[PDB]
From Swiss-Prot, chain B:
Record keywords, A-Z: Acetylation, Cytoplasm, Host-virus interaction, Nucleus, Proteasome
Induction: Up-regulated in asthenozoospermic sperm.
Gene Ontology biological process terms from the UniProt entry: proteasome-mediated ubiquitin-dependent protein catabolic process
Subunit structure: The 26S proteasome consists of a 20S proteasome core and two 19S regulatory subunits. The 20S proteasome core is a barrel-shaped complex made of 28 subunits that are arranged in four stacked rings. The two outer rings are each formed by seven alpha subunits, and the two inner rings are formed by seven beta subunits. The proteolytic activity is exerted by three beta-subunits PSMB5, PSMB6 and PSMB7.
N-acetylserine carried by residues: 1
Sites bearing N6-acetyllysine, chain numbering: 76
GO annotations of cellular component type: cytoplasm; cytosol; extracellular exosome; nucleoplasm; nucleus; proteasome complex; proteasome core complex; proteasome core complex, beta-subunit complex
Cited function: Non-catalytic component of the 20S core proteasome complex involved in the proteolytic degradation of most intracellular proteins. This complex plays numerous essential roles within the cell by associating with different regulatory particles. Associated with two 19S regulatory particles, forms the 26S proteasome and thus participates in the ATP-dependent degradation of ubiquitinated proteins.
Protein name in UniProt: Proteasome subunit beta type-3
Swiss-Prot record, chain D:
Its job: Non-catalytic component of the 20S core proteasome complex involved in the proteolytic degradation of most intracellular proteins. This complex plays numerous essential roles within the cell by associating with different regulatory particles. Associated with two 19S regulatory particles, forms the 26S proteasome and thus participates in the ATP-dependent degradation of ubiquitinated proteins.
Keywords: Acetylation, Cytoplasm, Disease variant, Host-virus interaction, Nucleus, Phosphoprotein, Proteasome
Molecular function GO terms recorded: lipopolysaccharide binding
Keyword Acetylation carried by entry: yes
Keyword Transport attributed: no
Species per Swiss-Prot/TrEMBL record: Homo sapiens
Name of this protein: Proteasome subunit beta type-4
Medical condition linked: Proteasome-associated autoinflammatory syndrome 3: An autoinflammatory disorder characterized by onset in early infancy and recurrent fever, nodular dermatitis, myositis, panniculitis-induced lipodystrophy, lymphadenopathy, and immune dysregulation. Variable accompanying features may include joint contractures, hepatosplenomegaly, anemia, thrombocytopenia, recurrent infections, autoantibodies, and hypergammaglobulinemia. Some patients may have intracranial calcifications. PRAAS3 inheritance is autosomal recessive or digenic.
Subcellular location: Cytoplasm; Nucleus
First-to-last residue of the parent protein present: 46 to 261 of 264
UniProtKB/Swiss-Prot annotation, chain F:
Keyword Translocase carried by entry: no
Stated name of the protein: Proteasome subunit alpha type-2
Keyword Phosphoprotein: yes
Chain's gene name: PSMA2
Keyword set, alphabetical order: Acetylation, Cytoplasm, Nucleus, Phosphoprotein, Proteasome
GO biological process: proteasome-mediated ubiquitin-dependent protein catabolic process; response to virus
N6-acetyllysine modification, residue list: 52, 153
Family label: Belongs to the peptidase T1A family.
Mod. after translation: Phosphorylated on tyrosine residues; which may be important for nuclear import.
Origin superkingdom: Eukaryota
Originating organism: Homo sapiens
UniProtKB/Swiss-Prot annotation, chain G:
Keywords: Acetylation, Cytoplasm, Host-virus interaction, Nucleus, Phosphoprotein, Proteasome
Name of encoding gene: PSMA3
Family: Belongs to the peptidase T1A family.
Subunit architecture: The 26S proteasome consists of a 20S proteasome core and two 19S regulatory subunits. The 20S proteasome core is a barrel-shaped complex made of 28 subunits that are arranged in four stacked rings. The two outer rings are each formed by seven alpha subunits, and the two inner rings are formed by seven beta subunits. The proteolytic activity is exerted by three beta-subunits PSMB5, PSMB6 and PSMB7. Interacts with AURKB. Interacts with CDKN1A. Interacts with MDM2 and RB1. Interacts with the C-terminus of TBXA2R isoform 2. Interacts with DNAJB2. (Microbial infection) Interacts with HIV-1 Tat protein.
UniProt-recorded name of the protein: Proteasome subunit alpha type-3
CDD domains documented for this protein: proteasome_alpha_type_3
UniProt modified residues of type N-acetylserine: 2
Disulfide feature: none
Function: Component of the 20S core proteasome complex involved in the proteolytic degradation of most intracellular proteins. This complex plays numerous essential roles within the cell by associating with different regulatory particles. Associated with two 19S regulatory particles, forms the 26S proteasome and thus participates in the ATP-dependent degradation of ubiquitinated proteins.
List of residues that carry N6-acetyllysine: 57, 206, 230
GO biological process terms, semicolon-separated: proteasome-mediated ubiquitin-dependent protein catabolic process
Length: 202, 204, 237, 216, 213, 215, 245
């Protein structure tokens, strides 16, 4: 599992792998870990799959009901706060690391981390999962202030390719999603579309 | 193990238009034999018996609460219970205690009260029904009973060959288990009669 | 006390349930829903009596989900409460059952809630009318209306409010004559019906139109320029 | 919280003549991983109370939520009554002891600094409910590595100026950067005086590494 | 696993007299090998005749003194009089035993005056067993102080000694001596000695410097 | 109670429902007139399945009716959880009439203004039952409900015989409604459900139309 | 006029034969026996004004505050019955608190007003409770949504208002707010106008002493609802005294 979301100017780019492991058996190799919470707010699910699907469905419920009452698009910080309240209230029953990323008219493109324990913090880029550990140095070296949409898609694709390469829990295809005002563009990177890197042979 | 605390060995075998249910007769607390006439097959109708092996207190508790629920059913409904419906009743009763479970594994042997078709089934301790057409066994000598029944069961037996088959199965099966035995009682259930025999078994 | 609470009269009637329909007429406002071939509109009037009031907040057209809308007629706080309950039941259907609630199932649910008001004596019937529109995935446009009695039905067209009976007579002469359909005619039929029985020759700041179409099932609340685009097209013929 | 996840390290605090100054580095670590590097571990409670916290940062965000809503709900009345720093300290002692007694602690260790009625307040509360007040506080490894420097200065000179206390806090943060492996070279310094609570930051330490060449 | 207790050190001491009760304690709050503060007295004025000494886990000590103060006010509301020393003793026995199964890790010594004007010392275990003593040391160095108090206040293991009643000045000398001797050898004991003297005139309260290690 | 007789007054004001127990099945025809042409008659149903083998119909008050449709279906499936056997029709009528009796004993509520015609097929044998708002239930050969049920109950008593087939019982259940229809019924303004050995089903209006053409 | 004795007007759980709930109407008639609170939203804020009657010279000159801070960005001007109005102040205050605790930001006006109008409505259909005898204005400002002014009556209906008036002289106050270009004025002109409109509709020969209470929220308070400075208040007092002449 490696999940990733990067804020840019105008919206956010989200990314995830597709590998779900039962121990060291790949139970699902095309997992959609990018969950549409509302129309322009997605989450990235890492951790226990039952926990993340339960909390994502419950925040989807509460957030859609909130948006119909308020007759407005919801805030990304509102969905992130609902994940925070659910993941902190049941932090001893849940093993769920969430990255909330989306766009809203009030505050632009936003990325929030809700890791295990249930805290919430806004970030420019967030990484999570068991494979994000292998790309902390890469994303610290590579993230530049003010990248564009295509540059953030390429940055997310490269970092997820690296994490899939080193983690055994990570693998599969790269599922990208870029959320802006015009809507959500999603894409799947598979095979040669996943950025290859050379193994230092000889 | 909680099941092997008292011993217990019940099987039910299907014949042509007849079923046979048979149980051992030892009540023992662990190694010590206490009585040799413990009831492990209770009547649940005219042509419908349940046999219970396992922990003897849960044999009694499950049989008494099943007789409770069954008498209320057969008075509220105005019919004798179908043996499949009895199986579902026992399965509900055992699955209500899913995390606090009755340490007994029933076998049900009977004829349909309207069709006289032979029914056998057996359940686990939390109520998974398991209908077969040849034999069901349950108890601390399960594998001995599987060997004897898988060898000796042949289809379409009259109640005499059914008696001989379930009798040799029970006797030679419980004579290779320590905490079972001390007698075997055998109920042959036909359309027109119930035959009940106790066997010359080893008493050690 | 046989006419104060919801218990039966000696001829089998519920008088508080009868008086809730009188309470619907207290609002002074008439709503009309008609249904087309691939569309279903709701039109109510938007009488704003106080001129230093924010007219963008006076509305009887309510979004229930993205695909289901709603016109309310009757006691206004009762209407907002029944709207909040419909929004709850829609979201909870989507949560528990994994798909968007049908219009008949939501209207049946709200009528099932209203029956409880008609049967327990400690609370009154909730004196207002809900008309739900929305596009069914298999049946097309659906127009459903639940009353304070707990009845609901599906409607080729319907009306709710003060001039309900004359609007019903108008639409009943209308739908046995033509099979009214198309996007334009169905707004025409629901604007003409309201206009004929109110007899006041609309300007677009005075009514409000809510639509669903099969081509885009999102419940839309019409812009005042779009009610102009229907009223000018209707007012020269 | 039976198991803390993203923790914050030492929070300092010292009274000076005219207020209290507290500091906390801006790092929340998951185990050893310096994962969250720009998080503020110092709360402004109200005009006269500030609060820095160690331990689990989700629990501190909970206490920020609850205590900030208490400050809001108090200021809605407009009745001229404010929560004192001692009142925030006592409420928080009751909260941490009450969570302790249910065997569900808030995994925090908190420094409540304050200044009301011309009197400085500095208060320690940890996850068991052990509360006290002192002229200098230090949680985590600050109780080992910073509280010596703090208490030796407060032994020689009981009454510090704001500049002396600020320099002493910076100096202890430099020590904690050298010797504490969960610390970080980016910290906020919060001050409460008569002028209210000001939170300054991010501040860095001046590193010295001359002993790295003294190995031969 | 979460541990709901910590031993914060601290030694307390009360001595009864003919017309006085002296309750004393060190002021060091400790944890492990650290010192939280050096000014945290463990004696608490409850009424104008009663001082409680609390040592052990300091969170329970704080909570328990706040409960005792609230129960004093509830008593004075429902009964229109302040509590006696024996009534606070019996009440605290009930308070401590109500928490039998998740105890207050607190060593309580109540020292004060009874209703005939004489000094009264009550010594409690963490679950509320008490008795009235002539003197009692509790807490961190109780096993150190209590033999010397058995020697000098109790007049035990002495032959041909005169059994004079203990005056206030000599009992103050004994309190200061025993806490110097405990500050030497107990590492949790030190930094000051707060001494509360309960007399007929009220409660006066003194402090004496001890070692800082 | 007086509210039980006043609840029966709301039943006798309701639309006619007729149910006839044939030899190989049970019909349940009702009156379903729309008040105007504006109402989609396809939408709401009066004949209603409870199980795959039990259906029912009513006279009186429809919203009261749906409350017991929902609770008959719950009692039926909680029987099926316990026994894994479809519920007997008579057992289900005991359960439902116990529910319908509960709202007469408790104060602060009124009785149901609805009377149910529960049909069924279990153990190769049809059943016709009527549950009254009191909570009392009666087994029937044939009966009427609603508006002029008395005249229907003596129209049925003249045309009922025991060696009657299900198709002929559909024919004489349409006639019992037609004795009180007031204005030319069609396949869109009545509603018939039948039990037989194949289970309960509500007849499609194309299938009601041919039965009406046979009359 | 004429009384009714059949008893349709004794519980809120009962309709009349012409379809009215008279207990709600009698609660709304309790509001029009109370002094006038006005509320005007402008280009950059909402301004509240209450003629708080002083029916003993012994009170503390600021007792019985009919202006409320229900959240730090929302304020509440009440008319009608004070004890019911303080109950609803606590309800609106708790509802704002619970919204922030659950969703993480300030409660929107139009959502606070709806969630409190639902409480007021839920006390209008039971026999065990009575309707509230207070109507009240909620007024907020923030940056994203602008000025927001809703009023909630005893019936439970909440509408948006550019100006609003609740109380016994509400109608002539609607008149003199209707003589005013509130959509273009700033908050500091609306306070002068609020003070003079309160001083016009105050009949001194029936109720003879009062204290004018003002509260604003807007750009000039950074979207915080406050009482407003005594200097600005007494300038509005002097403009209202001189304006009346």
């Amino acid at each position: 599992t490696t999940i990733m979301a990067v804020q840019f100017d105008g919206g956010v780019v989200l990314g995830a792998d597709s590998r779900t492991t039962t121990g060291s058996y790949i139970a699902n190799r095309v997992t959609d870990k990018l969950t549409p919470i509302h129309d322009r707010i997605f989450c990235c699910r890492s951790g226990s799959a039952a926990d993340t699907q339960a909390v994502a469905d419950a925040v989807t419920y509460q957030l859609g009901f909130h948006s119909i009452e308020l007759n407005e698009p919801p805030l990304v910080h509102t969905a992130a706060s609902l994940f925070k309240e659910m993941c902190y209230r049941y932090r001893e029953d849940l093993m769920a690391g969430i990255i909330i990323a989306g766009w809203d008219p009030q505050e632009g493109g936003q990325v929030y981390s809700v890791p295990m324990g249930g805290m919430m913090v806004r970030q420019s880029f967030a990484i999570g999962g068991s494979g994000s550990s292998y790309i902390y140095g890469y994303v610290d070296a590579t993230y530049r202030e003010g990248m564009t949409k295509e540059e953030c898609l390429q940055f997310t694709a490269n970092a997820l390719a690296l994490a899939m390469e080193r983690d055994g829990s990570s693998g599969g295809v790269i599922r990208l999603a870029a959320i802006a005002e015009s809507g959500v563009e999603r894409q799947v990177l598979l095979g040669d579309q996943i950025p290859k890197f050379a193994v230092a042979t000889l | 193990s909680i099941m092997s605390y008292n011993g217990g060995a019940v099987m039910a075998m299907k014949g042509k238009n007849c079923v046979a249910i048979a149980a051992d007769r030892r009540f023992g607390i662990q190694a010590q034999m206490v009585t040799t006439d413990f009831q492990k097959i209770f009547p649940m109708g005219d042509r419908l018996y349940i046999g219970l092996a396992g922990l003897a207190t849960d044999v009694q508790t499950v049989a008494q609460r099943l007789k409770f629920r069954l008498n209320l059913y057969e008075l509220k409904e105005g019919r004798q219970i179908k043996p499949y419906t009895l199986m579902s009743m026992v399965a509900n009763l055992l699955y209500e205690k899913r995390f606090g479970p009755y340490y007994t594994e029933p076998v049900i042997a009977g004829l349909d009260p309207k069709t006289f078709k032979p029914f056998i089934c057996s359940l686990d301790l939390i109520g998974c029904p398991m209908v077969t057409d040849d034999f069901v066994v349950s108890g601390t000598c399960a594998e001995q009973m599987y060997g004897m029944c898988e060898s000796l069961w042949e289809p379409n037996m009259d109640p005499d060959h059914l008696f001989e088959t379930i009798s040799q199965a029970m006797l030679n099966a419980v004579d290779r288990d320590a905490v079972s035995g001390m007698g075997v009682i055998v109920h042959i259930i036909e359309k027109d009669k119930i035959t009940t025999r106790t066997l010359k078994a080893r008493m050690d | 006390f046989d006419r104060h609470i919801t218990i039966f009269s000696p001829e089998g009637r519920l008088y508080q349930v009868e008086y809730a329909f009188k309470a619907i007429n207290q609002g002074g406002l008439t709503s009309v829903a008609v249904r087309g071939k691939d569309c279903a509109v709701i039109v109510t009037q938007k009488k704003v009596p106080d001129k230093l009031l924010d007219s963008s907040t006076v509305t009887h057209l309510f979004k229930i989900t993205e695909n289901i809308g709603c016109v309310m007629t009757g006691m206004t706080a009762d209407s907002r409460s029944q709207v909040q309950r419909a929004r709850y039941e829609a979201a909870n259907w989507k949560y528990k059952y994994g798909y968007e609630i049908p219009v008949d199932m939501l209207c049946k649910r709200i009528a099932d809630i209203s029956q409880v008001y008609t049967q327990n004596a400690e609370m009154r019937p909730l004196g207002c009318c809900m008309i739900l529109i929305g596009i069914d995935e298999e049946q097309g446009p659906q127009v459903y209306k639940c009353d304070p009695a707990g009845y609901y039905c599906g409607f080729k067209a319907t009306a709710a409010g003060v001039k309900q009976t004359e609007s019903t007579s108008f639409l009943e002469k209308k739908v046995k004559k033509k099979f009214d359909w198309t996007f334009e005619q169905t707004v025409e039929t629901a604007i003409t019906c309201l206009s004929t029985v109110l007899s006041i020759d609309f300007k677009p700041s005075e009514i409000e139109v809510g639509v669903v179409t099969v081509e885009n099932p999102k419940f839309r609340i019409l812009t005042e320029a779009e009610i102009d685009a229907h009223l000018v097209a209707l007012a020269e013929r | 919280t039976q198991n803390p996840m993203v923790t914050g390290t030492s929070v300092l605090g010292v009274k000076f003549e005219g207020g209290v100054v507290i500091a906390a580095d801006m790092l929340g670590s998951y185990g050893s991983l310096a994962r969250f590097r720009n998080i503020s571990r110092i709360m402004r409670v109200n005009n006269s109370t500030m609060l820095g916290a160690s331990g689990d940062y989700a629990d501190f965000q909970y206490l920020k939520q609850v205590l900030g809503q208490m400050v809001i709900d108090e200021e809605l009345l407009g009745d001229g009554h404010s929560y004192s720093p001692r009142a925030i300290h006592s409420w928080l002692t009751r909260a941490m002891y009450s969570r302790r007694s249910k065997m569900n602690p808030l995994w925090n260790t908190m420094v409540i600094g304050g200044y009301a009625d011309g009197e400085s307040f500095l208060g320690y509360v940890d996850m068991l409910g052990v509360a006290y007040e002192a002229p200098s506080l230090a949680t985590g490894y600050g109780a080992y590595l910073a509280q010596p420097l703090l208490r030796e200065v407060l032994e020689k000179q009981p009454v510090l100026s704001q500049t002396e206390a600020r320099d002493l806090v910076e100096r202890c943060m430099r020590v904690l950067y050298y010797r504490d492996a969960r610390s970080y070279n980016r910290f906020q310094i919060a001050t409460v005086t008569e002028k209210g609570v000001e939170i300054e930051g991010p501040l860095s330490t001046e590193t010295n590494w001359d002993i790295a060449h003294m190995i031969s | 696993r979460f541990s709901p207790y910590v031993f914060n050190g601290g030694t307390i001491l009360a001595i009864a007299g003919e017309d006085f009760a002296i309750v004393a304690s060190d002021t060091r709050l400790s944890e492990g090998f650290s010192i939280h503060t050096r000014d945290s007295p463990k004696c608490y004025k409850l009424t104008d005749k009663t001082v409680i000494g609390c040592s052990g886990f300091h969170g329970d000590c704080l909570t328990l003194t706040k409960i005792i103060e609230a129960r004093l006010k509830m008593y004075k509301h429902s009964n229109n009089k302040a509590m006696t020393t024996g009534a606070i003793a019996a009440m605290l026995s009930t308070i401590l035993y109500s928490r039998r199964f998740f105890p207050y890790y607190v060593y309580n010594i109540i020292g004060g005056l009874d209703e005939e004007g004489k000094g009264a010392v009550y010594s409690f275990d963490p679950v509320g067993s008490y008795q009235r003593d002539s003197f009692k040391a509790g807490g961190s160095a109780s096993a150190m102080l209590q033999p010397l108090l058995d020697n000098q206040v109790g007049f035990k293991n002495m032959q041909n000694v005169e059994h004079v009643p203990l005056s206030l000045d000599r009992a103050m000398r004994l309190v200061k001596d025993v806490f110097i001797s405990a500050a030497e050898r107990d590492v949790y004991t030190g930094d000051a000695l707060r001494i509360c003297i309960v007399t007929k005139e009220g409660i006066r309260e003194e402090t004496v410097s001890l070692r800082k290690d | 109670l007086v509210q039980i007789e006043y609840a029966l007054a709301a039943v006798a004001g309701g639309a006619p429902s007729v149910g006839i127990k044939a030899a190989n099945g049970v019909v349940l025809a009702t009156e379903k007139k729309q008040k105007s042409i504006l109402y989609d008659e396809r939408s709401v149903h009066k004949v209603e399945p409870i199980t795959k083998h039990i259906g029912l119909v009513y006279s009186g008050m429809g919203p009261d009716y749906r409350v017991l449709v929902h609770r008959a279906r719950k009692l039926a499936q909680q029987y099926y959880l316990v026994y894994q056997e479809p519920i007997p029709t008579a057992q289900l009528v005991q359960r439902v009439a116990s529910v319908m009796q509960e709202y007469t004993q408790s104060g602060g509520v009124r009785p149901f203004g609805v009377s149910l015609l529960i049909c069924g097929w279990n153990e190769g044998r049809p059943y016709l039952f009527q549950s009254d708002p009191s909570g009392a239930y009666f087994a029937w050969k044939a009966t009427a409900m609603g508006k002029n049920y008395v005249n229907g109950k003596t129209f049925l008593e003249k045309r009922y015989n025991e060696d009657l087939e299900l198709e002929d019982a559909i024919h004489t259940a349409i006639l019992t409604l037609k004795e009180s229809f007031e204005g030319q019924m069609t396949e869109d303004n009545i509603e018939v459900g039948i039990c037989n050995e194949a289970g309960f089903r509500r007849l499609t209006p194309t299938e009601v139309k041919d039965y009406l053409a046979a009359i | 006029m004429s009384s009714i004795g059949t008893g349709y007007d004794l519980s809120a759980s009962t309709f009349s034969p012409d379809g009215r709930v008279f207990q709600v109407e009698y609660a709304m008639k309790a509001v029009e026996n109370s002094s006038t609170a006005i509320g005007i939203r402008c280009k950059d804020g909402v301004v509240f004004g209450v003629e708080k009657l002083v029916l003993s010279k012994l009170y503390e000159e600021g007792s019985n505050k009919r202006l409320f801070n229900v959240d730090r960005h929302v304020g509440m001007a009440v008319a009608g019955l004070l004890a019911d109005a303080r109950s609803l102040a606590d309800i609106a205050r708790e509802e704002a608190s619970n919204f922030r605790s659950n969703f993480g930001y300030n409660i929107p006006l139009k959502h606070l007003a709806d969630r409190v109008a639902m409480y007021v409505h839920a006390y209008t259909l039971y026999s065990a409770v009575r309707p509230f005898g207070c109507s009240f204005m909620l007024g907020s400002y923030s940056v994203n949504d602008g000025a927001q002014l809703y009023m909630i009556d005893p019936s439970g209906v909440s509408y948006g208002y550019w100006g609003c008036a609740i109380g016994k002289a509400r109608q002539a106050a609607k008149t003199e707010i209707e003589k005013l270009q509130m959509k273009e004025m700033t908050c500091r002109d609306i306070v002068k106008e609020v003070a003079k409109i309160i001083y016009i509709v105050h009949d001194e020969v029936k109720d003879k002493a009062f204290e004018l209470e003002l509260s604003w929220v807007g750009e000039l308070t950074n979207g915080r609802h406050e009482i407003v400075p005594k200097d600005i208040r007494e300038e509005a007092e002097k403009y209202a005294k001189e304006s009346l002449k």
